Design an enzyme around this catalytic site. Structure first.
Site, PDB file in Angstrom:
ATOM      1  N   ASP A  62      98.162  -4.929 -37.584  1.00 35.51           N
ATOM      2  CA  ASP A  62      97.321  -4.835 -36.359  1.00 35.51           C
ATOM      3  C   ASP A  62      96.619  -6.104 -36.210  1.00 35.51           C
ATOM      4  O   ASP A  62      95.571  -6.266 -36.603  1.00 35.51           O
ATOM      5  CB  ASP A  62      96.715  -4.072 -36.401  1.00 35.51           C
ATOM      6  CG  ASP A  62      95.420  -4.051 -35.086  1.00 35.51           C
ATOM      7  OD1 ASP A  62      96.004  -5.163 -34.261  1.00 35.51           O
ATOM      8  OD2 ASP A  62      94.922  -3.092 -34.788  1.00 35.51           O
ATOM      9  N   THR A  63      96.717  -7.138 -35.771  1.00 31.56           N
ATOM     10  CA  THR A  63      96.321  -8.835 -35.301  1.00 31.56           C
ATOM     11  C   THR A  63      95.052  -9.200 -34.721  1.00 31.56           C
ATOM     12  O   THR A  63      94.795  -9.617 -34.910  1.00 31.56           O
ATOM     13  CB  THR A  63      97.478  -9.876 -35.180  1.00 31.56           C
ATOM     14  OG1 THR A  63      97.708  -9.032 -33.553  1.00 31.56           O
ATOM     15  CG2 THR A  63      98.531 -10.069 -35.899  1.00 31.56           C
ATOM     16  N   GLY A  64      94.514  -7.989 -33.631  1.00 32.63           N
ATOM     17  CA  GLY A  64      93.697  -7.687 -33.292  1.00 32.63           C
ATOM     18  C   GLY A  64      92.219  -6.305 -33.811  1.00 32.63           C
ATOM     19  O   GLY A  64      91.091  -6.411 -32.836  1.00 32.63           O
TER      20      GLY A  64
HETATM   21  C1  LIG Z   1      90.679  -2.075 -34.762  1.00 25.93           C
HETATM   22  C2  LIG Z   1      89.003  -1.802 -35.312  1.00 25.93           C
HETATM   23  C3  LIG Z   1      88.832  -2.703 -36.060  1.00 25.93           C
HETATM   24  C4  LIG Z   1      88.889  -3.156 -33.994  1.00 25.93           C
HETATM   25  N1  LIG Z   1      88.023  -4.373 -33.904  1.00 25.93           N
HETATM   26  C5  LIG Z   1      87.763  -5.360 -34.286  1.00 25.93           C
HETATM   27  O1  LIG Z   1      88.297  -5.519 -35.099  1.00 25.93           O
HETATM   28  C6  LIG Z   1      86.555  -5.620 -33.946  1.00 25.93           C
HETATM   29  C7  LIG Z   1      86.070  -6.738 -32.539  1.00 25.93           C
HETATM   30  N2  LIG Z   1      85.863  -5.912 -34.640  1.00 25.93           N
HETATM   31  C8  LIG Z   1      84.221  -5.268 -35.466  1.00 25.93           C
HETATM   32  O2  LIG Z   1      83.920  -4.441 -34.468  1.00 25.93           O
HETATM   33  O3  LIG Z   1      83.297  -5.730 -36.272  1.00 25.93           O
HETATM   34  C9  LIG Z   1      81.967  -5.978 -36.345  1.00 25.93           C
HETATM   35  C10 LIG Z   1      80.950  -6.170 -35.868  1.00 25.93           C
HETATM   36  C11 LIG Z   1      81.591  -5.231 -34.325  1.00 25.93           C
HETATM   37  C12 LIG Z   1      80.138  -4.744 -33.498  1.00 25.93           C
HETATM   38  C13 LIG Z   1      79.156  -5.786 -33.732  1.00 25.93           C
HETATM   39  C14 LIG Z   1      79.138  -6.982 -34.596  1.00 25.93           C
HETATM   40  C15 LIG Z   1      80.349  -6.376 -35.527  1.00 25.93           C
HETATM   41  C16 LIG Z   1      89.827  -2.947 -32.468  1.00 25.93           C
HETATM   42  O4  LIG Z   1      89.127  -1.948 -31.620  1.00 25.93           O
HETATM   43  N3  LIG Z   1      91.480  -3.948 -31.803  1.00 25.93           N
HETATM   44  C17 LIG Z   1      91.505  -3.361 -30.579  1.00 25.93           C
HETATM   45  C18 LIG Z   1      91.161  -4.008 -29.564  1.00 25.93           C
HETATM   46  C19 LIG Z   1      90.358  -4.403 -29.113  1.00 25.93           C
HETATM   47  C20 LIG Z   1      89.809  -5.889 -30.230  1.00 25.93           C
HETATM   48  C21 LIG Z   1      88.556  -6.295 -29.806  1.00 25.93           C
HETATM   49  C22 LIG Z   1      87.074  -5.938 -29.178  1.00 25.93           C
HETATM   50  C23 LIG Z   1      88.201  -5.051 -28.294  1.00 25.93           C
HETATM   51  C24 LIG Z   1      89.337  -4.030 -28.435  1.00 25.93           C
HETATM   52  C25 LIG Z   1      93.244  -2.961 -31.111  1.00 25.93           C
HETATM   53  O5  LIG Z   1      93.622  -4.657 -31.882  1.00 25.93           O
HETATM   54  C26 LIG Z   1      93.819  -2.483 -31.547  1.00 25.93           C
HETATM   55  O6  LIG Z   1      94.354  -2.395 -32.830  1.00 25.93           O
HETATM   56  C27 LIG Z   1      94.214  -0.848 -31.587  1.00 25.93           C
HETATM   57  C28 LIG Z   1      93.811   0.020 -32.732  1.00 25.93           C
HETATM   58  C29 LIG Z   1      93.974   1.177 -32.403  1.00 25.93           C
HETATM   59  C30 LIG Z   1      95.124   1.797 -31.742  1.00 25.93           C
HETATM   60  C31 LIG Z   1      95.157   2.739 -31.725  1.00 25.93           C
HETATM   61  C32 LIG Z   1      94.833   3.937 -30.673  1.00 25.93           C
HETATM   62  C33 LIG Z   1      92.790   2.878 -31.308  1.00 25.93           C
HETATM   63  C34 LIG Z   1      93.320   2.271 -31.786  1.00 25.93           C
HETATM   64  N4  LIG Z   1      93.850  -0.369 -30.273  1.00 25.93           N
HETATM   65  C35 LIG Z   1      93.864  -0.527 -28.967  1.00 25.93           C
HETATM   66  O7  LIG Z   1      92.162  -0.363 -28.736  1.00 25.93           O
HETATM   67  C36 LIG Z   1      94.647  -0.720 -28.129  1.00 25.93           C
HETATM   68  N5  LIG Z   1      95.323   0.806 -28.025  1.00 25.93           N
HETATM   69  C37 LIG Z   1      96.850   1.485 -28.160  1.00 25.93           C
HETATM   70  O8  LIG Z   1      97.887   0.930 -27.799  1.00 25.93           O
HETATM   71  C38 LIG Z   1      96.467   2.641 -26.566  1.00 25.93           C
HETATM   72  C39 LIG Z   1      97.101   2.770 -25.975  1.00 25.93           C
HETATM   73  N6  LIG Z   1      95.778   3.338 -27.655  1.00 25.93           N
HETATM   74  C40 LIG Z   1      95.984   4.776 -28.350  1.00 25.93           C
HETATM   75  O9  LIG Z   1      97.283   4.776 -28.818  1.00 25.93           O
HETATM   76  O10 LIG Z   1      95.259   5.734 -28.373  1.00 25.93           O
HETATM   77  C41 LIG Z   1      94.446   6.794 -28.511  1.00 25.93           C
HETATM   78  C42 LIG Z   1      93.807   7.540 -28.630  1.00 25.93           C
HETATM   79  C43 LIG Z   1      92.687   6.681 -28.028  1.00 25.93           C
HETATM   80  C44 LIG Z   1      91.511   7.863 -28.369  1.00 25.93           C
HETATM   81  C45 LIG Z   1      91.336   8.876 -29.383  1.00 25.93           C
HETATM   82  C46 LIG Z   1      92.535   9.233 -30.085  1.00 25.93           C
HETATM   83  C47 LIG Z   1      93.362   8.780 -29.722  1.00 25.93           C
HETATM   84  C48 LIG Z   1      94.366  -0.884 -26.765  1.00 25.93           C
HETATM   85  C49 LIG Z   1      93.712  -2.117 -26.961  1.00 25.93           C
HETATM   86  C50 LIG Z   1      95.499  -0.862 -25.571  1.00 25.93           C
END
Ligand SMILES: CC(C)[C@H](NC(=O)[C@H](C)NC(=O)OCc1ccccc1)C(=O)N[C@@H](Cc1ccccc1)[C@@H](O)[C@H](O)[C@@H](Cc1ccccc1)NC(=O)[C@@H](NC(=O)[C@H](C)NC(=O)OCc1ccccc1)C(C)C
Ligand SMILES: O=C(O)Cc1cc2ccccc2s1
EC number: 3.4.23.16
Lengths: 99, 99
Positions: free
Chosen positions: A25-27
């Site tokens: 996961d590059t994001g």
């Molecule tokens: C996984 C986290 C470590 C990541 N966040 C971070 O790296 C961050 C910004 N870092 C961070 O928090 O650093 C420490 C910190 C934080 C706050 C303050 C100070 C310090 C993240 O949420 N990253 C996401 C993008 C993003 C980045 C920055 C800010 C906001 C969003 C996606 O890359 C990411 O890879 C996937 C991970 C993921 C996959 C599947 C489910 C849940 C999460 N998520 C997504 O959020 C994507 N969803 C999906 O592709 C779909 C459609 N989801 C899905 O299948 O959801 C199912 C589900 C949801 C809820 C409950 C159960 C199931 C979205 C961007 C379109």
């Protein structure tokens, strides 16, 4: 490997002699797993994503293998629906995005 | 290009004739951008991440250039903290993970 992205980029990992599956996961800044019995105590940490913020357990110095590539770093345990290999480990295996 | 992952993989995009910055995210199934207007009709959608769900407007068949590379596809718009290019558009530009 060279991994196209038509499906989620799930790979086999090894953590504490258990094979798991996780998303390259590059994001993701950090690596986040749903569970394990990683050696004992943990420090709390906040992380954010699209829906808001969640509290996670941070474990440091965790040995992990990703498609047989050895790495060591910090691993969070938290309420993620999928195991996530984030940049902190992706860099250690020399993973790049290319186009 | 070849992009290493020591920092967030932010790149320049162009959409609706305006240049923006967006995160190339292999962990995103879909592409989610900050509030903007786009052409055509939208439909309502909910998408899940870390932290929960958000409401977004789905636009189909939207042209976007990612580092100068053309892609046409679904773009969701709503209260995201970062512009995210997901797999639906990464595949169109022939983006791959490599290690
Ligand atoms: C996984 C986290 C470590 C990541 N966040 C971070 O790296 C961050 C910004 N870092 C961070 O928090 O650093 C420490 C910190 C934080 C706050 C303050 C100070 C310090 C993240 O949420 N990253 C996401 C993008 C993003 C980045 C920055 C800010 C906001 C969003 C996606 O890359 C990411 O890879 C996937 C991970 C993921 C996959 C599947 C489910 C849940 C999460 N998520 C997504 O959020 C994507 N969803 C999906 O592709 C779909 C459609 N989801 C899905 O299948 O959801 C199912 C589900 C949801 C809820 C409950 C159960 C199931 C979205 C961007 C379109
Ligand atoms: O009201 C708007 O302008 C936009 C939206 C409403 C809604 C409701 C449910 C799911 C997604 C969306 S987007």
């Amino acid at each position: 490997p060279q991994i196209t992205l038509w499906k989620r980029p799930l790979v086999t990992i090894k953590i504490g002699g258990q094979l798991k599956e996780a998303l390259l996961d590059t994001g993701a800044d950090d690596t986040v797993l749903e569970e394990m019995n990683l050696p004992g105590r943990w420090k709390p940490k906040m992380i954010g994503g699209i829906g808001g913020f969640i509290k996670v357990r941070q474990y440091d110095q965790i040995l992990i293998e990703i498609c047989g590539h050895k790495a060591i770093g910090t691993v969070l345990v938290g309420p993620t629906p999928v195991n996530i290999i984030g940049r902190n480990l992706l860099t250690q295996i020399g993973c790049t995005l290319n186009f």
